[PDB]
Design a protein around this nucleic acid. Sequence first.
DNA 1: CCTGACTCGA
DNA 2: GCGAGTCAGGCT
Length: 580
Amino acid sequence: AAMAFTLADRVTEEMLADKAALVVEVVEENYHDAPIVGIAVVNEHGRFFLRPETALADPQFVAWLGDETKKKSMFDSKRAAVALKWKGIELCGVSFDLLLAAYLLDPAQGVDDVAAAAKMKQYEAVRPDEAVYGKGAKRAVPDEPVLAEHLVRKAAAIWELERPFLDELRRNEQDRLLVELEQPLSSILAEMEFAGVKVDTKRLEQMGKELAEQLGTVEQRIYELAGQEFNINSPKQLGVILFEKLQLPVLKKTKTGYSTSADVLEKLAPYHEIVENILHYRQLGKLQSTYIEGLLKVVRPDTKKVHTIFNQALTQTGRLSSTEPNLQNIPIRLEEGRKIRQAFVPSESDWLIFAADYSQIELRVLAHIAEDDNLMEAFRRDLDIHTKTAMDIFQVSEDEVTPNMRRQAKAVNFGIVYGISDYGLAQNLNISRKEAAEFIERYFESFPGVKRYMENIVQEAKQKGYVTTLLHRRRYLPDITSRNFNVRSFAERMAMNTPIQGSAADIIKKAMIDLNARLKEERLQAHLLLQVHDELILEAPKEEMERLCRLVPEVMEQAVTLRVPLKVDYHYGSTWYDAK
DNA sequence: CCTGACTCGA
DNA sequence: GCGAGTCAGGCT
Ligand SMILES: OC[C@H]1O[C@@](CO)(O[C@H]2O[C@H](CO)[C@@H](O)[C@H](O)[C@H]2O)[C@@H](O)[C@@H]1O
Ligand SMILES: [Mg+2]
């Protein structure tokens, strides 16, 4: 059942038509400075397989790659583009990306290879990558005969599937979402990843020594208070020491034993001095393992830069994710871990780190979408939304709002977003269900429009089978009809949450696209480095700071127009840490 | 070599 | 709500 194709030893004219399905294979998961093991091209003239050494050394092929008028259809073009950037080659003209097309059609499928996407249209004349390359220790590039056939079949699938995918996207009203948002964004993410972020490894290594010391003191202390020695990182050994040897009370049980989660230990703290030391130990240990040692492992020794990979087709809400390393979860909440950020510095001398973040974008989106008069007015007055919520649900004046009141109103606001739950709120505020449900009820009394939205969005999810975001991203919720209370409730929360988190993601993605267009028009040297859900991190010459102070916020605030204003705060400094 | 338990972020 | 990386423990 083999597929016909030419295993070319040299590049020819017909291989350079103005439309083709292109495959530039990089098997290494992390594609940075990784090898391109083969190339496949399928067009009106036929199917071809080219050896990378050959094709990439050919002036005509490289020019075709960089010709914006020569259209290419691909799967995960960002992977190819970055792999090519490292080789000094530019990839242009990608008009269709099957990975992004599949992702928008149904994020739930978890499409990560051509075979998975093809299966959505009953196309199975191609094998899953894992079948061909294997995985883990067994992972490996097969011989040319098998490799060449696999790449050709993938190119063939892409070539065949483009039309049906575009047609459905069109029916879904997601055609612009792919062509004007996700695809252009893919090119921006590639530039960001390729650029990387400079790390002050000596700073990290010094912080590492200090931690190793402190971690050592707290460690001995723990063995001293426990009366012996054990693996504190062993939740199994810890549970025995705490609940058996020290007789501490059991407030929460896990699935395999006792629960030693911070939320539990926080309640045990009063009973024994070892609990605080275990918590502190848990802190320092997290910083050392993940952010010191874990980070140092992925810094490029030659450039001292870390090159993350943004997974643009994974989250169910439209958000990006980041790996190797994850630069979207760098410490900031606790001062000790926040210092980790001093290690992220500008990649050039006399340059600075500029960070801009949307203020309460999710709640503002909710105000717009629900059209709640009270909430819209609150933002129109640019009020401290948490103080305002407390004033309403506790019926008091601004002056009568105590810190504890605001803290709880804040927790209610956070819950309303993730999809309110009396039980979930109860655990968060450490109170009973009735009490939590009382707050929620009081909240809905103050924000009737929000309540109406929650009810209406759940109904719509059941009527249509999915919910959507501002820019037409969708999420199917089959569980919404489940007769199992728990399963159904999770789906209902997703129905409430996705349009909020999802619309917030659409907005920042568009802002990134708009911002890049503005930076180019202005010929500014400033460029994007990272995106952290609701914030943008850039680096630029110190001479560009003043222009950025006006430009970045404006572009971000004007990305979309809502019934309430969009607000962006910004800071800049010598290091990421100082950009506060 | 996979899963549970933990903690980091928005 | 949505994510990723570490460790320990069981696989084997
Ligand atoms: O660029 C990432 C891109 O590739 C996919 C596979 O289609 O993920 C691969 O690469 C990631 C980064 O190296 C890994 O985290 C992941 O495990 C690997 O399969 C897509 O998820 C993504 O869009
Ligand atoms: Mg913010």
